[PDB]
């Protein structure tokens, strides 16, 4: 259809949505993962060193 100023109005909401998700959702939901992986590793290092 016809190009419209909407192209610029939406670039705002886009770029800002990216930050208000990045700064407060992404590192948190990766923290909830990594903090469990750090634990999954310990049980295995236990079992192996205990066999030894």
């Amino acid at each position: 259809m016809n190009l419209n100023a909407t192209i610029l109005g939406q670039a705002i909401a886009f770029v800002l949505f990216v930050l208000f998700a990045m700064k407060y959702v992404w590192p948190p939901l990766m923290a909830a993962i990594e903090k469990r992986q750090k634990e999954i590793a310990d049980g295995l290092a236990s079992a192996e060193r205990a066999h030894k």
Partner: protein, 52 residues
């Protein structure tokens, strides 16, 4: 298993320790027997040799 690796390891070690030393306790008893007998018979043979 990370509890086992102490609770049972130390007991295997202790039992082996105690038996490793009481083997030698019996062996010391045996050398007591031997070095008693070494004199006990030698003196009888002396009392034969000088009666001869």
């Amino acid at each position: 298993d990370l509890d086992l690796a102490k609770a049972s390891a130390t007991d295997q070690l202790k039992k082996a320790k105690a038996e490793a030393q009481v083997i030698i306790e019996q062996a010391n008893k045996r050398r007591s027997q031997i070095l008693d007998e070494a004199k006990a018979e030698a003196e009888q043979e002396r009392t034969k040799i000088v009666a001869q």
